Chain length 186, copies 6
Amino acid sequence: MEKKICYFEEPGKENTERVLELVGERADQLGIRNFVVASVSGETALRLSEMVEGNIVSVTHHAGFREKGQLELEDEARDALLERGVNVYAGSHALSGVGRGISNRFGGVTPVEIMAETLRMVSQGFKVCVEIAIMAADAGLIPVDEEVIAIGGTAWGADTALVLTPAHMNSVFDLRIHEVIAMPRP
Amino acid sequence: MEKKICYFEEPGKENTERVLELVGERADQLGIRNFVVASVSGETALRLSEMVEGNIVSVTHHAGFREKGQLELEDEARDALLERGVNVYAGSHALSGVGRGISNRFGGVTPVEIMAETLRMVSQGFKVCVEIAIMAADAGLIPVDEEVIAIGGTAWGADTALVLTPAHMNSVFDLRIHEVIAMPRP
Amino acid sequence: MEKKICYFEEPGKENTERVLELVGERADQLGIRNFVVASVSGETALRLSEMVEGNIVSVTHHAGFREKGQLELEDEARDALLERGVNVYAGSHALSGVGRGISNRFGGVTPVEIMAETLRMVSQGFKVCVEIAIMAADAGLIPVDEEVIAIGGTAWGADTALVLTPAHMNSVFDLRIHEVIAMPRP
Amino acid sequence: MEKKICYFEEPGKENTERVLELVGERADQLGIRNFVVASVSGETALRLSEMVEGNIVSVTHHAGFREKGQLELEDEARDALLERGVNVYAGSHALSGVGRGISNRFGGVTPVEIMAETLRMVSQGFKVCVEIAIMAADAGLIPVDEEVIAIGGTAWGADTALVLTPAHMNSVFDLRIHEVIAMPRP
Amino acid sequence: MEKKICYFEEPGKENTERVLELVGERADQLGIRNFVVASVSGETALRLSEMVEGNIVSVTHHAGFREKGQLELEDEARDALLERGVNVYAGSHALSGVGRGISNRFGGVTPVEIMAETLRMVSQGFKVCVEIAIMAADAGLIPVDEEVIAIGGTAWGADTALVLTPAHMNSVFDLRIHEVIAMPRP
Amino acid sequence: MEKKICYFEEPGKENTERVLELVGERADQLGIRNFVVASVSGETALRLSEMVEGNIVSVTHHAGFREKGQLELEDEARDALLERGVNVYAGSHALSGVGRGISNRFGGVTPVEIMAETLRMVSQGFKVCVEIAIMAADAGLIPVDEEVIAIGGTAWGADTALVLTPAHMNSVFDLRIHEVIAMPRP
Ligand SMILES: Cc1cc2nc3c(=O)[nH]c(=O)nc-3n(C[C@H](O)[C@H](O)[C@H](O)COP(=O)(O)O)c2cc1C
Ligand SMILES: Cc1cc2nc3c(=O)[nH]c(=O)nc-3n(C[C@H](O)[C@H](O)[C@H](O)COP(=O)(O)O)c2cc1C
Ligand SMILES: Cc1cc2nc3c(=O)[nH]c(=O)nc-3n(C[C@H](O)[C@H](O)[C@H](O)COP(=O)(O)O)c2cc1C
Ligand SMILES: Cc1cc2nc3c(=O)[nH]c(=O)nc-3n(C[C@H](O)[C@H](O)[C@H](O)COP(=O)(O)O)c2cc1C
Ligand SMILES: Cc1cc2nc3c(=O)[nH]c(=O)nc-3n(C[C@H](O)[C@H](O)[C@H](O)COP(=O)(O)O)c2cc1C
Ligand SMILES: Cc1cc2nc3c(=O)[nH]c(=O)nc-3n(C[C@H](O)[C@H](O)[C@H](O)COP(=O)(O)O)c2cc1C
Ligand SMILES: [Mg+2]
Ligand SMILES: [Mg+2]
Ligand SMILES: [Mg+2]
Ligand SMILES: [Mg+2]
Ligand SMILES: [Mg+2]
Ligand SMILES: [Mg+2]
Ligand SMILES: [Mg+2]
Ligand SMILES: [Mg+2]
């Protein structure tokens, strides 16, 4: 089958509305009731929870990513979303992990970090979609035998959306990517 | 200076009481306001809930640990736990991660998993104490800037537990374990 | 930039005709004259040459891929292609390399082989697409300057075609994936 | 069951006495016929020699640790040690090895060194206890089939020490640490 | 089998003439007609072709070795060689590969790059000798069946020549080094 | 300079006498008073100590290599050699190390083990010469700023001899190989 795909001329927040727009169509065009978003402030899971219904999992950065100790999400939004039925999750990025701490001391690269860099060959959002997909799968916040739409972007906002089948951390290479709804061309 | 500890003859189930009680006593005698433990069902964290004050938390097996998309913390028990007034988490085990995915796929081991296995030299329960310890910190729950008490066990119980100032994954090795309370001798 | 993208219900040689047609169109659309294509036997290379014009580079399997000291590409087929003006190349595979020799001897996985399994979560051709892009660049057979259309498939023929900018082995992570002309959905 | 241990406020030199004395007491109270320690000069093993019965041994810094081909165990002290009636060794540190060669050359870390760093979370002195522990066993000296007492320290002393049934390198992970005696809290 | 071996006091282009002469002799002696030679510019390849007969394969640097999208081998020099019957080849370097792209991005070392530093403890050419042997085999340019004379040097010209049996990338450790015709002693 | 080298038609013990014979000449032809042998039973360091004088370091397998616990060398020969002025050493093989234990559990390969396999491309003895060279350097049993002759072989006896400059474990890639006295051609 032939479907439309949107290539953002440039990566970034400028693109957040369109991405959420295609997510709506596709999701309905396919009957996907499972959504996984990368929202650190929450501005995205929110804008999405008011355009679709079903299962919205919002993943934010791990505790202390900008400044050790405190997490960039305030239970202030963790409620503005917990009200809308949106699941809220903070955990360790599955495509960095501890190998990240290591490489921070010693300065090399662990195997999963290479999975990330490779995925960033298409776009940054492309990589996070896969990452959050795994995170939620393992956190039991989403199915591993049903398609799902993961939403991500470059730094803030959204510019990448994928129709994919999550896989758990121990069966990570089972994760399949079915369709690319939107992505930054660069 | 000085303090006190204990040593199990053989590993297992039949120790969480002795562990718990003692882990509690010591836990209490030491005096802190932030905790963490490892129950794949919840029981062992059930017995714990009613003997401490502040922040208990019961990380469990990431979904799919046994069968794709099947966390074990029964919602009957999840409800129970959360209700008993104390936090619940499920995420990817900080000391294996996607790493275990690659290994399950290819047949060797990654850095991160090297660690679990080191720690295990002492006691299987020894490592989990660090594993779950780290996850908990990453979920924005427990501190990395004050002491916490780590409790865990081997196979089907809760035989080991320590005292450390856990840490995140991007600065992992900044983890400082401070005291041992109990552990299987072998 | 909304465009079309074909999702093949299943992977395989059957899709070839459609992907060769789709590349033609996208090439005219973007003004691309560089094509790198994985063709073990050369058949796929042959077809493509008849629908597209410019620099076509066909890379076959490395000698020894199936039998020690043996090249799968028949002398006749090579001759036929070179007669048409298609640069034909063969060399150790970019996303496995000597790292595979190592694993065939010791079992685990080397860093470069992980990049490939990671690319595979999209499709097999998706992985050959960047792989042959790297090989062709290093051979000096295609530019790492401008855009190129990369074509790959599952074992026989073709089912994946990408629009990308190659990069050399020493600067792999400088490889950019721009558009997915077609890909097997599974 | 149960036993006793201790906790240093800050790390160092000023503890080997307290350590030693106590490491001895406990060492004695526990009763065993095979020992091992970490003195880069020999002193700390001097103080030890006269307080135990059976097999003491004093592994030191591999030659070139400071300057090419310069072991530190002064022959004045080597003579002393060996004379005092108890074994002396010098070899490559079991938890870095050529690995550290590669890292010094390239800039990351190898499996083996991953371990040292894990162990160090507790105390720098914690790891050496395993390092020298393992070397000693490999030199045909101390047993892997009975308990041994491991003593070591941080910087310029002897602050940590354990009880384990060490192991070889070809079957390393079969190492079973059994008891803690003393250690720097941080 | 007592034979001669030349040890050059120092490495470099100066030794070329002697190694080209020595290979000639050893080739007659053993009845070898396969030669793989590292010649970036092609000069060295040119000389060799005039003293030896049979299949000569000259491998130059991969495109991008010095400047993005650039091949060091001049079109003129290639032409000259091919005019003489010397198979000329270029492709990503066998003992670094994409593993170098990775390190250039993250710093440590990949497994394949260690093989090279290890080969280098003999001389630089010693390392290019097996490296170009692997590349030529995978290109199907030389056999992994019989013996071949491999020629390499330090940056310019030649100072190392080996008698070996190539092997493919997937069976690297099947590469056999038989005789060292000449090598820089340092 | 042009020197003779012996290529054993086949690897093994059959070759032990010749190797020791060339060692004598070369050593004298060069003024090398430092010898490093790989002798597990001791049959070799012995046969050598009676044909040369200077510094003979005999290295045997690490404790329990065939059968954990006990070392293949009896203090019976450890004296028959300790009498002849020969230094006797048992330690952990520097080109295996702990990574060896790991790979024994998990089944992959660590970096140093790859250094070994690579070196075995020329001969097995070639590899051990480098290994024992390192072992002794670090054990302070030999110089790191003077040439030395390391002796090794395939399984038992000797068939490989190298004139090389040892390097310590932390500067391993400084080790230089100057001359190859004898080696098995296969
Ligand atoms: C687990 C997680 C992983 C992320 N990693 C990256 C990353 O690799 N690179 C990147 O450009 N953005 C990354 N992001 C950003 C997301 O793509 C997205 O821009 C952001 O979370 C949206 O938050 P906002 O709604 O507050 O803008 C990450 C954020 C999360 C939650
Ligand atoms: C994240 C997590 C990690 C664990 N890893 C291990 C492990 O590697 N080794 C082990 O033997 N037990 C492990 N456990 C087992 C538990 O610590 C322990 O068996 C517990 O008793 C199970 O809880 P339950 O008794 O309440 O069912 C792990 C459990 C959890 C939650
Ligand atoms: C270097 C290279 C690597 C390739 N690796 C794969 C692979 O990873 N997976 C796969 O399904 N096919 C792979 N192939 C096959 C191509 O994707 C493709 O199926 C091609 O059509 C074979 O050509 P043919 O139809 O002329 O026989 C690769 C081919 C080459 C030349
Ligand atoms: C093999 C060996 C390994 C060691 N590694 C470490 C290490 O990684 N961390 C550390 O801080 N001290 C290390 N040490 C230090 C000693 O355990 C300790 O400082 C000791 O006091 C020095 O002996 P001395 O006081 O008799 O001179 C090491 C020493 C030896 C012999
Ligand atoms: C793929 C390949 C890799 C090589 N890598 C090295 C290297 O590792 N070290 C080095 O000193 N020279 C290396 N070279 C250069 C050759 O060893 C050699 O010096 C050659 O003479 C250059 O040829 P020229 O005299 O025609 O310019 C390599 C050359 C190629 C083609
Ligand atoms: C540290 C050490 C490393 C060795 N590793 C190998 C090896 O990698 N492969 C091999 O074929 N022989 C190996 N050997 C064997 C030696 O090359 C040599 O044959 C033997 O030690 C001579 O002992 P013998 O005099 O009792 O026969 C090793 C022995 C020692 C001492
Ligand atoms: Mg935003
Ligand atoms: Mg892009
Ligand atoms: Mg224990
Ligand atoms: Mg797909
Ligand atoms: Mg401590
Ligand atoms: Mg040399
Ligand atoms: Mg023998
Ligand atoms: Mg040989």
